[PDB]
Design a protein around this ligand. Structure first.
Ligand SMILES: [Zn+2]
Length: 257
């Protein structure tokens, strides 16, 4: 099945998921010189004080930190969005080396990693229904650069030993995702897709301009994870990123001057 090798990676996904060659695929390169400032965009409202993390899972493609999304406890609103979007999970994409790993790029610059906070539109009732709608999801994307450690990431890093291989999970309560946000909420936005199969064109992307800094040691621990299951040949979970896709008939809008 699909993955990030030579034989099963992004360049093959279209055979099982033809929407891979669609009109609104993600990620994309963000050309900062052609993204136009849109004064009509609102400030983003990130309301994560009541968030309830539950569990962390290695799904064979990344690790997901999962939230209780049975009520409006951690929501994203404002920005480009109409209505209320509930946080369901976050995960990352990262590289084998610090010079690649992000999905979005900025003027062709690749960051070491990218965080995706995934939220679904409450008007559709559940995640599975939301992903069938063009405005079903809002994904907040945050770039990671290597420098100073991110204190608020360390709790994540230190549990990764317990979910080394595909299908392992661990309890992961009381984690506060506010500790993963940069200072500024300035953003770019465009309409796109999930970046992994099934590649559904259901996402309003909100990509923050300001990266967070993580330490080399932190990212090194991500790279100790495995794509494989327990007692299978070890294949390090690295380079779990889809490259930039054609922008096609889209515009990327900036919330800032
Ligand atoms: Zn992602």
């Amino acid at each position: 099945h699909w993955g990030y090798g030579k034989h099963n990676g992004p360049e093959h996904w279209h055979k099982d998921f033809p929407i891979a060659k669609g009109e609104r695929q993600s990620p994309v390169d963000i050309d900062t010189h052609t993204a136009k400032y849109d004064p009509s965009l609102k400030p983003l409202s990130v309301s994560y004080d009541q968030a309830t993390s539950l569990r962390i899972l290695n799904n064979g493609h990344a690790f997901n930190v999962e939230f209780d999304d049975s009520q409006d406890k951690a929501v994203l609103k404002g920005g480009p969005l109409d209505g209320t979007y509930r946080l369901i999970q976050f995960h990352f994409h990262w590289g084998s080396l610090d010079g690649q790993g992000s999905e979005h790029t900025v003027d062709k610059k690749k960051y070491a990693a990218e965080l995706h906070l995934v939220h679904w539109n409450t008007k559709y009732g559940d995640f599975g229904k939301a992903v069938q709608q063009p405005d079903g999801l809002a994904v907040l994307g945050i770039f990671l650069k290597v420098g100073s450690a991110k204190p608020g990431l360390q709790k994540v890093v230190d549990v990764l030993d317990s979910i080394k291989t595909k299908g392992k999970s661990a309890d992961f309560t009381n984690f506060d995702p506010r500790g993963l946000l940069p200072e500024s909420l300035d953003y770019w936005t465009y309409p796109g897709s999930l970046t992994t199969p099934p590649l559904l064109e259901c996402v309003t992307w909100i990509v923050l301009k300001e990266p967070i800094s993580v330490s080399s040691e932190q990212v090194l621990k991500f790279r100790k994870l495995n794509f494989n299951g327990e007692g299978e040949p070890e294949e390090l979970m690295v380079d779990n990123w889809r490259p930039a896709q054609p922008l096609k008939n889209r515009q990327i809008k900036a919330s800032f001057k």
